Amino acid sequence: SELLVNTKSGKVMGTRVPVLSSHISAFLGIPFAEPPVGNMRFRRPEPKKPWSGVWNASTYPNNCQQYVDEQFPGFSGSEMWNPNREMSEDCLYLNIWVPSPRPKSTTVMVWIYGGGFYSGSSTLDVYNGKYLAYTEEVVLVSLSYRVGAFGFLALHGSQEAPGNVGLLDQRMALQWVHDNIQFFGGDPKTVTIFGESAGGASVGMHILSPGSRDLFRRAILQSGSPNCPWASVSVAEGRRRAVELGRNLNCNLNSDEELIHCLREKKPQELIDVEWNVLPFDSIFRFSFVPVIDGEFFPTSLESMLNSGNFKKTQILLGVNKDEGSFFLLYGAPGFSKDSESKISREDFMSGVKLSVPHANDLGLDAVTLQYTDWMDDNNGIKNRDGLDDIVGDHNVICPLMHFVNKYTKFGNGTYLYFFNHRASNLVWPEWMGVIHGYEIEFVFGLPLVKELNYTAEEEALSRRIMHYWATFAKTGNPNEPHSQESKWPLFTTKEQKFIDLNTEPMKVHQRLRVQMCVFWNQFLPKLLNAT
Amino acid sequence: SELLVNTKSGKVMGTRVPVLSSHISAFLGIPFAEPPVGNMRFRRPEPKKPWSGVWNASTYPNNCQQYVDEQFPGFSGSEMWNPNREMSEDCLYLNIWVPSPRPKSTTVMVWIYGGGFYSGSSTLDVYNGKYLAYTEEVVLVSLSYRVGAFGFLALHGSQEAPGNVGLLDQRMALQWVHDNIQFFGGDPKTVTIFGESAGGASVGMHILSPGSRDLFRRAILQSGSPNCPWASVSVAEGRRRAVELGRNLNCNLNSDEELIHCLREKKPQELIDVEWNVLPFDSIFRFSFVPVIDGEFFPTSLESMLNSGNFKKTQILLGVNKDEGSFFLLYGAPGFSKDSESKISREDFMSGVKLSVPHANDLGLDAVTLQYTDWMDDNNGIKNRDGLDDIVGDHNVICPLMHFVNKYTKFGNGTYLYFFNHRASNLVWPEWMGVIHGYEIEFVFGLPLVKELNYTAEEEALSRRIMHYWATFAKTGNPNEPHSQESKWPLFTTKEQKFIDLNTEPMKVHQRLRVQMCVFWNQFLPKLLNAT
């Protein structure tokens, strides 16, 4: 049967699903690890024990335990990101979409969801891999991994909560793909991992980590890189946050043994209710439990690894959205509201700057403010709002990705860069937010191809171009068709630094994406904070 | 006789001079102080002893001893600034141009020449006051003062070389004007002092200094303010430079008495030949012997005086030229040449930055470089050249003047600001230098009205407008004609900060002259250098 597959872990029974008036196979909720429950909470994952009989993979699995956004009850804009399945610590499963008839050895794409390392689900409507699997004829895989304290609590030195276990969950899923995707028609030697935000940072982390490198061929990073200021912390800060978490739950803090044991007795929602109380600063775009530079998953500092070429050398495709920061300002900066133009005063602008660059001394805050203020029109509400939006995006997403791309390209085998600046016609978020963080995802997964979702014809065409760029890159290492007549996406080189815009207009090539600001954030500011 | 005037110091015999096919009286070389020679070198000036008989004031006096620019022998561009009379330490004289018939009580304008406090003459062709005296019907006075070590050697604590004696020379000349200009037809209660560069800085210094304030009514500052980074030094740096001067001439350095005595035995050219060897840094736009914050001429720091309103409150008219810095780059920065486009490389750009902001640590140099570099086109020779030109001008002239105007306007009785951006059609300097430091002077003194000098008709018209603005301001405290139909030069206020451009085009009003850069130079950079 087309829906029956015998893997090395046991037999699996999938289901046939309709897609654009056709059909493909779907294998949902395939376990790739032992449920990290009880004494296993905080521990590295263990392989799923083989099973006899047939595993019923016709329905989505549970979502990992996580914080749930309730800032806008009912609102589809925010709820489309919340878990759509029951949450459970038993959540290490993966999903596979296979073309029909089943391929013999086709290109594989493994999606790693984002969510700031504190949230995310592989089962969201926006991540339905059936469209992309069907349209581009690829085996689409989406995995899951522990988030929040459950996946990143780090007490370096102990084996009970070493940290980075969430990344190890991802690696384990990749290991399963490498060992079993051949039975689903996938070519294990041609797997492209791709992700957005924390997922994009994760992809970059597997490129850097020696233990993950041999598990995939190519990579795509969307609005996220390993070196982002929010993507990782030192073992010292990790330890400090783990202890403070224990303090919020009145735990015995005399030893790691004591702390860990007390934390394992807590219900999941108990850790979640106090998770945000451990941040060191009043801030925006900063998360509690994230990856840690431990000396194991990451041999040394990320900067020294990038400088020495200590990473997987292959082809990469990556880029960012025009307005990465608006989302975090809406939720945490004074002056911003979902239902108003959010024109910001001078007062709130500087309040916003302090929140965006929490680690900065006064000289630093002044440098940022001077860099993003137009002194010929400083009380212009729209300029201050957009200035703040740019700060959050440049500091947290764009400038760190540009640092990565430039460092990577010196040792890589091919880089392709994009700048997504199309605002979807059916967006429910206000206009001032622009091309929002995470909204390029729907074009990558091809939602615009479904008439009932209400996109325009140019947005459907844009989605097909993007799906074809992503899949062609996954297959060949080049997003362009060999003998095509279409416009060519130039290769990003150390010298020209070319990139393209991604919208419904005729392709335009540019150079040095936001260089002026990137030099400020990557060269000047760090130098200033270190000297003062 | 129209040419005979009986002053309180004695009788003076002037001469009749032709001007634009008419005539006016000129009294040249009137002594206002005892010759500061011998034991008087470095000392405060003493009033000229009254004389019997008639003083022959028909010819220009000598020019003070000074460094003479020989970088371009023969070249009119540079030689028009060199002394055109024999140099002599006996040089404290003033010149007066009086309309004919002699006025009864008309507006007086006293010109104070610039020259970085190390050079300058009241007898240059560009300073011929006959045109302005004739055209606007005012009594025009040009004074002289000691420059270089002769006027600013400062060994605070001793009365033999206290410092600031050059400023005291100016004050003494102003005292003579106050006491005698009535005999030449001038109104001593309506005197406007005006000057350019060091002369503009001098004017600002008399506004600040308690002992000079009662000697004039209004003031005009052209491309120079008291708070310029090159216009003054601490008593400590003054002392250090005086000692180093003595060291270059192998003087006894055991005591001030010893040093001063040894310096007084040296021929004038001997001090001049080593004057430039005492600068603390390798630099551009920095001069050896300049005014010193002594606690006498200047009660306290200039910044505290400006903040507390400790200065003469009256009306002021001031402004700057578009390209103040090009002159200093041509003479001292690598890559610039008089006969080439001077396109600058990245190498020489940063070399130039180090020379322009000599007091800056590495973090500071990086701040400046980032502030003036276009990273989308960093190897553009023309952008680097112009960037450097702007740095020198903004740091040394424009930003310090804007700080002054903004501080002054809070306590003053009326401010008028201009931005001179017209490049004379007959300039002999290369095009890349633009609207050069000091070239607005010729329009103020009305040289364009003389056909034989080869200016265009629009430049003659521009000169008349400027002469009329300056003189009307001198008379009324407002450059505009009460019931005129011409465009109005708005008043600069703390709120609007309006200013006008000065060229041959229809008047255009603007706001916040180079604010972006001024905030960098007046608020940010100083904060950075003080914290690091």
Side-chain angles (χ1 to χ4, degrees), chain A residues 1-63 65-90 92-250 252-261 263-398 400-517 519-532, chain B residues 1-63 65-90 92-250 252-261 263-398 400-517 519-532:
Chain A
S1 173
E2 188 170 65
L3 308 173
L4 184 66
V5 176
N6 192 21
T7 76
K8 299 174 177 170
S9 288
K11 297 185 191 167
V12 180
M13 180 87 261
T15 175
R16 156 165 276 230
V17 307
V19 56
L20 302 178
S21 85
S22 183
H23 296 89
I24 55 83
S25 308
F27 299 80
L28 313 178
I30 298 177
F32 66 77
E34 283 295 303
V37 300
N39 270 38
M40 285 184 74
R41 181 187 288 175
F42 306 131
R43 279 186 199 163
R44 296 189 175 86
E46 292 308 312
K48 172 67 172 181
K49 294 182 173 73
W51 62 82
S52 293
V54 184
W55 184 282
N56 185 332
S58 66
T59 69
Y60 277 141
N62 295 301
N63 295 158
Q65 286 286 180
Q66 52 186 276
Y67 171 75
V68 174
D69 172 33
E70 280 174 56
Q71 180 65 197
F72 300 111
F75 191 52
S76 60
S78 56
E79 278 166 353
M80 65 171 100
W81 304 106
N82 286 334
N84 60 356
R85 294 285 151 183
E86 225 86 75
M87 294 190 285
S88 169
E89 269 182 286
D90 176 0
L92 294 185
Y93 303 81
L94 61 79
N95 309 298
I96 313 180
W97 282 276
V98 188
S100 182
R102 181 194 297 175
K104 301 306 168 183
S105 189
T106 187
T107 300
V108 182
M109 293 183 70
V110 181
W111 171 255
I112 303 175
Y113 61 68
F117 289 115
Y118 71 82
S119 57
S121 305
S122 66
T123 65
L124 307 179
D125 302 319
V126 280
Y127 303 149
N128 196 323
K130 80 187 194 175
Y131 304 113
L132 186 56
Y134 176 65
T135 306
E136 290 300 319
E137 313 176 58
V138 303
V139 167
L140 196 288
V141 179
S142 66
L143 53 71
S144 68
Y145 60 95
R146 290 171 280 173
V147 297
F150 306 99
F152 300 90
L153 180 85
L155 288 169
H156 189 63
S158 96
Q159 297 313 325
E160 288 318 310
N164 295 331
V165 303
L167 292 174
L168 292 182
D169 289 338
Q170 294 172 13
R171 174 184 291 167
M172 184 143 74
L174 293 184
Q175 183 65 59
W176 198 86
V177 168
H178 184 274
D179 303 323
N180 298 283
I181 206 64
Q182 70 197 75
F183 304 117
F184 296 85
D187 172 16
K189 70 179 57 245
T190 303
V191 45
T192 294
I193 56 177
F194 70 133
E196 185 270 341
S197 202
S202 285
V203 163
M205 288 171 177
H206 290 293
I207 288 168
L208 300 174
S209 182
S212 297
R213 332 228 281 230
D214 312 349
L215 297 183
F216 64 98
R217 177 68 164 270
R218 278 182 276 275
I220 299 175
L221 298 74
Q222 306 178 203
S223 304
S225 61
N227 61 316
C228 287
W230 51 267
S232 69
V233 298
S234 64
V235 299
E237 177 58 4
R239 171 164 290 279
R240 184 225 138 227
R241 291 179 191 188
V243 172
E244 189 60 33
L245 175 64
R247 196 188 301 283
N248 273 265
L249 300 176
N250 319 304
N252 187 323
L253 311 185
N254 297 308
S255 66
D256 288 346
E257 294 53 48
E258 228 106 27
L259 176 52
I260 299 176
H261 175 283
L263 288 173
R264 284 181 178 162
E265 291 303 299
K266 303 302 177 177
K267 292 169 172 45
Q269 197 49 50
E270 306 191 71
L271 288 67
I272 296 174
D273 288 336
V274 298
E275 179 186 320
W276 299 97
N277 299 344
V278 307
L279 286 181
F281 310 111
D282 186 356
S283 60
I284 182 191
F285 220 130
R286 291 294 189 276
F287 318 116
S288 295
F289 303 99
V290 298
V292 51
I293 309 306
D294 61 352
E296 295 168 54
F297 192 102
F298 300 108
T300 62
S301 74
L302 297 180
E303 195 52 41
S304 62
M305 291 188 74
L306 290 174
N307 273 315
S308 64
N310 192 4
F311 50 79
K312 187 196 184 58
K313 281 103 175 185
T314 182
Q315 303 81 40
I316 57 169
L317 186 156
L318 70 184
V320 303
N321 289 359
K322 188 184 184 304
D323 308 289
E324 302 285 358
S326 64
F327 214 117
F328 305 77
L329 287 160
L330 167 58
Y331 281 58
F336 299 76
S337 296
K338 183 169 81 53
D339 300 346
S340 78
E341 277 185 299
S342 300
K343 295 171 179 170
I344 304 299
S345 62
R346 254 293 111 179
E347 329 289 64
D348 293 328
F349 180 76
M350 296 190 282
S351 252
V353 169
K354 180 58 175 174
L355 249 40
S356 308
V357 193
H359 55 300
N361 59 16
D362 280 7
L363 181 64
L365 294 175
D366 290 341
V368 174
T369 289
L370 169 52
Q371 190 72 183
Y372 286 86
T373 299
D374 170 6
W375 300 101
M376 299 194 274
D377 191 29
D378 64 304
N379 286 315
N380 179 151
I382 292 176
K383 282 187 175 173
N384 294 330
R385 176 240 280 150
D386 300 332
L388 215 39
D389 199 316
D390 281 334
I391 284 172
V392 183
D394 291 346
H395 171 59
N396 293 297
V397 178
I398 303 171
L401 186 139
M402 288 311 295
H403 183 65
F404 181 74
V405 60
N406 275 299
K407 287 293 179 185
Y408 188 89
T409 294
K410 174 180 186 313
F411 298 86
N413 188 231
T415 305
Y416 294 94
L417 183 61
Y418 72 79
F419 182 73
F420 184 80
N421 56 350
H422 174 69
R423 183 185 153 95
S425 60
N426 52 13
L427 253 180
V428 291
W429 294 103
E431 296 301 296
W432 70 262
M433 295 177 79
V435 186
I436 305 176
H437 183 64
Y439 283 78
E440 82 288 348
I441 293 182
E442 51 200 63
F443 288 80
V444 171
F445 280 77
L447 288 299
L449 312 195
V450 319
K451 324 292 181 180
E452 26 296 356
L453 289 184
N454 298 334
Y455 289 85
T456 65
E458 23 282 307
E459 295 180 315
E460 181 188 317
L462 175 55
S463 185
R464 284 175 187 290
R465 290 171 53 206
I466 288 174
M467 283 184 283
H468 194 64
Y469 283 150
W470 267 224
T472 300
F473 167 74
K475 305 190 192 90
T476 68
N478 185 333
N480 305 290
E481 280 281 44
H483 304 289
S484 161
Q485 292 305 317
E486 301 303 313
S487 304
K488 297 301 177 182
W489 184 335
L491 195 70
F492 170 105
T493 65
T494 302
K495 188 182 171 178
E496 324 305 310
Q497 301 168 198
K498 296 178 176 178
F499 73 96
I500 67 169
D501 284 312
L502 231 37
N503 52 56
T504 62
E505 293 175 59
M507 185 184 274
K508 295 187 180 181
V509 171
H510 302 300
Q511 296 176 270
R512 305 192 170 195
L513 176 50
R514 292 182 76 64
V515 257
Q516 207 62 41
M517 294 306 95
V519 167
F520 172 78
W521 295 102
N522 300 322
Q523 297 184 203
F524 186 70
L525 188 53
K527 172 154 180 169
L528 177 162
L529 296 170
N530 182 239
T532 71
Chain B
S1 173
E2 188 170 65
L3 308 173
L4 184 66
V5 176
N6 192 21
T7 76
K8 299 174 177 170
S9 288
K11 297 185 191 167
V12 180
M13 180 87 261
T15 175
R16 156 165 276 230
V17 307
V19 56
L20 302 178
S21 85
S22 183
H23 296 89
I24 55 83
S25 308
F27 299 80
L28 313 178
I30 298 177
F32 66 77
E34 283 295 303
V37 300
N39 270 38
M40 285 184 74
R41 181 187 288 175
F42 306 131
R43 279 186 199 163
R44 296 189 175 86
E46 292 308 312
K48 172 67 172 181
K49 294 182 173 73
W51 62 82
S52 293
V54 184
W55 184 282
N56 185 332
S58 66
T59 69
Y60 277 141
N62 295 301
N63 295 158
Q65 286 286 180
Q66 52 186 276
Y67 171 75
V68 174
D69 172 33
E70 280 174 56
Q71 180 65 197
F72 300 111
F75 191 52
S76 60
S78 56
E79 278 166 353
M80 65 171 100
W81 304 106
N82 286 334
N84 60 356
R85 294 285 151 183
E86 225 86 75
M87 294 190 285
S88 169
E89 269 182 286
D90 176 0
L92 294 185
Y93 303 81
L94 61 79
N95 309 298
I96 313 180
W97 282 276
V98 188
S100 182
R102 181 194 297 175
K104 301 306 168 183
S105 189
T106 187
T107 300
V108 182
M109 293 183 70
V110 181
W111 171 255
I112 303 175
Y113 61 68
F117 289 115
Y118 71 82
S119 57
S121 305
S122 66
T123 65
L124 307 179
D125 302 319
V126 280
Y127 303 149
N128 196 323
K130 80 187 194 175
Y131 304 113
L132 186 56
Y134 176 65
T135 306
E136 290 300 319
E137 313 176 58
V138 303
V139 167
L140 196 288
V141 179
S142 66
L143 53 71
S144 68
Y145 60 95
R146 290 171 280 173
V147 297
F150 306 99
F152 300 90
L153 180 85
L155 288 169
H156 189 63
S158 96
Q159 297 313 325
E160 288 318 310
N164 295 331
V165 303
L167 292 174
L168 292 182
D169 289 338
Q170 294 172 13
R171 174 184 291 167
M172 184 143 74
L174 293 184
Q175 183 65 59
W176 198 86
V177 168
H178 184 274
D179 303 323
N180 298 283
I181 206 64
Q182 70 197 75
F183 304 117
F184 296 85
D187 172 16
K189 70 179 57 245
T190 303
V191 45
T192 294
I193 56 177
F194 70 133
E196 185 270 341
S197 202
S202 285
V203 163
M205 288 171 177
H206 290 293
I207 288 168
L208 300 174
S209 182
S212 297
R213 332 228 281 230
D214 312 349
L215 297 183
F216 64 98
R217 177 68 164 270
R218 278 182 276 275
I220 299 175
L221 298 74
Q222 306 178 203
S223 304
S225 61
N227 61 316
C228 287
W230 51 267
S232 69
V233 298
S234 64
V235 299
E237 177 58 4
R239 171 164 290 279
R240 184 225 138 227
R241 291 179 191 188
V243 172
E244 189 60 33
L245 175 64
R247 196 188 301 283
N248 273 265
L249 300 176
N250 319 304
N252 187 323
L253 311 185
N254 297 308
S255 66
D256 288 346
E257 294 53 48
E258 228 106 27
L259 176 52
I260 299 176
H261 175 283
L263 288 173
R264 284 181 178 162
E265 291 303 299
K266 303 302 177 177
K267 292 169 172 45
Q269 197 49 50
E270 306 191 71
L271 288 67
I272 296 174
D273 288 336
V274 298
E275 179 186 320
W276 299 97
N277 299 344
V278 307
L279 286 181
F281 310 111
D282 186 356
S283 60
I284 182 191
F285 220 130
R286 291 294 189 276
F287 318 116
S288 295
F289 303 99
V290 298
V292 51
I293 309 306
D294 61 352
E296 295 168 54
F297 192 102
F298 300 108
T300 62
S301 74
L302 297 180
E303 195 52 41
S304 62
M305 291 188 74
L306 290 174
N307 273 315
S308 64
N310 192 4
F311 50 79
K312 187 196 184 58
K313 281 103 175 185
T314 182
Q315 303 81 40
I316 57 169
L317 186 156
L318 70 184
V320 303
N321 289 359
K322 188 184 184 304
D323 308 289
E324 302 285 358
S326 64
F327 214 117
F328 305 77
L329 287 160
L330 167 58
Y331 281 58
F336 299 76
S337 296
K338 183 169 81 53
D339 300 346
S340 78
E341 277 185 299
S342 300
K343 295 171 179 170
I344 304 299
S345 62
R346 254 293 111 179
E347 329 289 64
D348 293 328
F349 180 76
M350 296 190 282
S351 252
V353 169
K354 180 58 175 174
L355 249 40
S356 308
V357 193
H359 55 300
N361 59 16
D362 280 7
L363 181 64
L365 294 175
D366 290 341
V368 174
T369 289
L370 169 52
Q371 190 72 183
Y372 286 86
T373 299
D374 170 6
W375 300 101
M376 299 194 274
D377 191 29
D378 64 304
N379 286 315
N380 179 151
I382 292 176
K383 282 187 175 173
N384 294 330
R385 176 240 280 150
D386 300 332
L388 215 39
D389 199 316
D390 281 334
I391 284 172
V392 183
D394 291 346
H395 171 59
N396 293 297
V397 178
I398 303 171
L401 186 139
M402 288 311 295
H403 183 65
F404 181 74
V405 60
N406 275 299
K407 287 293 179 185
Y408 188 89
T409 294
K410 174 180 186 313
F411 298 86
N413 188 231
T415 305
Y416 295 94
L417 183 61
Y418 72 79
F419 182 73
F420 184 80
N421 56 350
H422 174 69
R423 183 185 153 95
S425 60
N426 52 13
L427 253 180
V428 291
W429 294 103
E431 296 301 296
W432 70 262
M433 295 177 79
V435 186
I436 305 176
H437 183 64
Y439 283 78
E440 82 288 348
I441 293 182
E442 51 200 63
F443 288 80
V444 171
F445 280 77
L447 288 299
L449 312 195
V450 319
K451 324 292 181 180
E452 26 296 356
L453 289 184
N454 298 334
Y455 289 85
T456 65
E458 23 282 307
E459 295 180 315
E460 181 188 317
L462 175 55
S463 185
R464 284 175 187 290
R465 290 171 53 206
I466 288 174
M467 283 184 283
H468 194 64
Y469 283 150
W470 267 224
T472 300
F473 167 74
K475 305 190 192 90
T476 68
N478 185 333
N480 305 290
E481 280 281 44
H483 304 289
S484 161
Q485 292 305 317
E486 301 303 313
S487 304
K488 297 301 177 182
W489 184 335
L491 195 70
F492 170 105
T493 65
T494 302
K495 188 182 171 178
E496 324 305 310
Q497 301 168 198
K498 296 178 176 178
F499 73 96
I500 67 169
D501 283 312
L502 231 37
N503 52 56
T504 62
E505 294 175 59
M507 185 184 274
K508 295 187 180 181
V509 171
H510 302 300
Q511 296 176 270
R512 305 192 170 195
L513 176 50
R514 292 182 76 64
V515 257
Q516 207 62 41
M517 294 306 95
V519 167
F520 172 78
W521 295 102
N522 300 322
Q523 297 184 203
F524 186 70
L525 188 53
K527 172 154 180 169
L528 177 162
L529 296 170
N530 182 239
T532 71

